[PDB]
Design a protein around this nucleic acid. Structure first.
Ligand code: IHP
Ligand code: IHP
Ligand code: ZN
Ligand code: ZN
Lengths: 454, 384
RNA sequence: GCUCGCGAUGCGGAGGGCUCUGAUAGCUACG
RNA sequence: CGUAGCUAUCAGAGCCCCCCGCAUCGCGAGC
């Protein structure tokens, strides 16, 4: 018992409360300890849990790691063990994302800070870990409704936190390309190099890490957290409520007029989309025409971390993937929990999704049910807006520099199809899933990406 | 040693309370502390002397959503009357093993071979459910207080509210109607904070008044069993209880053979019980005839205080069922539907029970009372 | 007879904080 | 042999705080 051992180890220790926050089950107190001259702390929804984790941090830093809680143990990246000890990275990136969220909501006071799932992307450039940078912050645990889907690329289909965070990572990527391409002076400050095999690659040792307040829905979350001692089915988000249900191994594929007479919109679960990302990259098809594949190095969970189930959800379940195009791969990033994981607040989901990318001055708020911002407009994150960025980047890069031949681009879907190797990796991923007994990916009716900018 | 409805009601209440006392060291144990007491009493004839207490339980809480077990090791619902049914199930399994041991032991079993296939109760074996208060939901919600000759009947029998399916909600108070087009529960949704929903006891007892008290699995061995009486020790309201237990689903149709809409005797007792003072215990006790001692389960976790599975949990019941299954000759099964050994699938092998359950769900829907709210399917996807 | 909105008085499982009592456990102090 | 105290847990009676459909009455409107 942590404080008991800490006060039978250096028995004169006095604990300092700093700042209480929240209401009902969403409340947290911060507790601190001074022992052997080092300022420690933990977090917890009641005092005697925050103090317990503060004591655990003290004894970890001085003496030793406590109960080698066995599913609480982190897989490690195949390549890039560069940002030092996995727990120290995990705790750093969760703290960074929580701090940026605080800044973005009047120090957790704005009405938009009441959220169920927080998420974020954090960038490192160095083996040194003190030089991180929060790239994007998002919330949301909800999805557009059948009657609200856009044919003009003007509505966010998925507003779950992880997903919104990735779209903000795409906004950051377009900004970085435009930065490299606006001045020979600014090329030194872009995250991108000219690449030897063509187009752009990331400057060496630039890596991105993904934080989610909880485990992604679907497969990484199908376990009992109080008995950790197994069939990675593709699952789809149920419209209406939070949570997912497994893909039906035989049922008809969606079409645009069918989501308005008999059925709702079937969106893939966040586990599946992250697994997807671990093969095709986090940059999607359109960016791939300009840059070499980008993969996350870390998936840090602020709760419901379980090493086996997350391993399965994120890469192991599709180990059977074959013949990936060049530079694609089965990314096996670092997976970790955090120390003072947050608590389960049993309540109804918020209805808004918050997003912010580094560069912007303020968060943007989206009704996840209509995929529009709460006075009825298109998000900076939506299909149409990203495509607008992409068109502006295409206009500045010579026809030689492209990673794919695409000339005179008009329609979204066709510009996506121009990304031949990425579509190849997409097909390989789909087949891996089918052949593993895990169901077939549900794709949207291709009419909703059938739109020009005009 | 006679019959009269009020005589019977008082007799079963005395027996359950007395047996509870015997089990709790004359109510001096820390575990005697209870808000709600429930039990099952078995009769075999007209002599009140012949009544036998089968199970006793307490509890007023249900499992915390974070503690759901995907291996069937946790009790989901510790309201006393639900626990009392599960304890009776243990008894039913024991009685089948008694029948199967040998021809001499067979005489003592409450089961006999059935002419329709499988087994059925011997003539005049009856079970009676006792609850120290009105079951939550439809029977309880519109008057959660003791009745007085002065207060009228329900001044509003025709409100939409009357008869609706309702759920307990985790961290919520009261029970709630199912919403118009209420969306299905998911394992990952509950884990992330969607509040776990459980059907109210009023709704569960009505279900048992259609599909029987034995559950699906036992129905693979035995014909449907019904309560002959429901005895409340306090907060009796005749019109609400009668509506809740059956009258609300008098529109049910097309039940499979041997199923019926059972309308048991409903009664209060002559000397109504009192409110018990005290913060309500977070634990639940259970006992079945033949057990040496009570079992104490933390209702919020669904396991005992050392984290062990209850003798009443799904996994334990699946084990009892599997042992009997290996002993019953195929020609004696009531169903010959082969299904893979996963709790969910074995239940599906009880085809007629599933049909009766379907008629029940439909009765509620067509009556305007809402749709039954089931657990995430992942709950039952485990094997021994 | 209901249904909906607003108001009013009440009724019926969570989280958190401050006290009072009992039990265990570990560590001090003093005679 | 004691008393005193300090933490860590449990167990139990209090005081707040804060959440999360139903009853009774009134007003408006509708079926
Ligand atoms: O961030 P998400 O909400 O998960 O969006 C993705 C993304 O679409 P956009 O970038 O156009 O929004 C995928 O696009 P690419 O990765 O190919 O660039 C697209 O897949 P396809 O365009 O390859 O079909 C997929 O749609 P889906 O998998 O249903 O076809 C869609 O996810 P949602 O449709 O669920 O928003
Ligand atoms: O009396 P309870 O403790 O509430 O248990 C019942 C029982 O399940 P178990 O016997 O496995 O504990 C029902 O099973 P049947 O005997 O009726 O077949 C099951 O209904 P299903 O038939 O769908 O399994 C129902 O679960 P659900 O509420 O999802 O219908 C579940 O109730 P709880 O989940 O409330 O314990
Ligand atoms: Zn999700
Ligand atoms: Zn109940």
């Amino acid at each position: 018992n942590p404080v008991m051992i800490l006060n039978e180890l250096r028995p004169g220790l006095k604990y300092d409360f700093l700042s209480e926050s929240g209401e009902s089950h969403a409340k947290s107190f911060v507790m601190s300890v001074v022992v052997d001259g080092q300022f420690f702390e933990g977090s917890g929804r009641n005092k005697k849990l925050a103090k317990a984790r503060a004591a655990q941090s003290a004894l970890a830093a001085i003496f030793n790691l406590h109960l080698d809680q066995t599913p609480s143990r982190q897989p490690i990246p195949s390549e890039g063990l560069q940002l030092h000890l996995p727990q120290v990275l995990a705790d750093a990136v969760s703290r960074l994302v929580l701090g940026k969220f605080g800044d973005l909501t009047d120090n957790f006071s704005s009405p938009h800070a009441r959220r169920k799932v927080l998420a974020g992307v954090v960038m490192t450039t160095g083996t040194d870990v003190k030089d991180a940078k929060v790239i994007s912050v998002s919330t949301g645990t909800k999805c557009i409704n059948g009657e609200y889907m856009s044919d003009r690329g003007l509505a966010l289909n998925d507003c779950h936190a992880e997903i919104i965070s990735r779209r903000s990572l795409l906004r950051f990527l377009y900004t970085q390309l435009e930065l490299y391409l606006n001045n020979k002076d600014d090329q030194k400050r872009s995250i991108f190099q000219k690449s030897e095999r063509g187009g752009f690659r990331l400057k060496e040792n630039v890596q991105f890490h993904l934080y989610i307040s909880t485990s992604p829905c679907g497969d990484a979350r199908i376990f009992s957290p109080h008995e950790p001692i197994a069939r990675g089915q593709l699952r789809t988000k149920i419209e209406s409520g939070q949570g997912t249900i497994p893909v039906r191994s035989n049922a008809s594929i969606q079409t645009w007029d069918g989501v308005l007479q008999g059925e709702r919109l079937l969106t893939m679960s966040c586990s599946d989309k992250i697994a997807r990302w671990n093969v095709v990259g986090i940059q999607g098809s359109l960016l791939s025409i300009f840059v070499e594949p980008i993969y996350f190095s870390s998936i840090i969970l602020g709760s419901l971390y379980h090493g086996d189930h997350l391993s399965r959800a994120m890469y192991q379940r599709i180990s059977n993937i074959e013949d990936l195009p060049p530079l694609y791969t089965l990314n096996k990033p670092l997976l970790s929990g955090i120390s003072n994981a947050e608590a389960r607040q049993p309540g109804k989901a918020p209805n808004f999704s918050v997003n912010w990318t580094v560069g912007d001055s303020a968060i943007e708020v989206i009704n996840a049910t209509t995929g529009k911002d709460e006075l009825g407009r298109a998000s900076r994150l939506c299909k149409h807006a990203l495509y607008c960025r992409w068109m502006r980047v295409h206009g500045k890069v010579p026809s030689h520099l492209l990673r794919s031949k695409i000339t005179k681009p008009n329609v979204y879907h066709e510009s996506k199809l121009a990304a031949k190797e990425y579509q190849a990796a997409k097909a390989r991923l789909f087949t891996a899933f089918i052949k593993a007994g895990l169901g077939a990916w549900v794709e949207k009716p291709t009419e909703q990406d059938q739109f020009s900018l005009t």
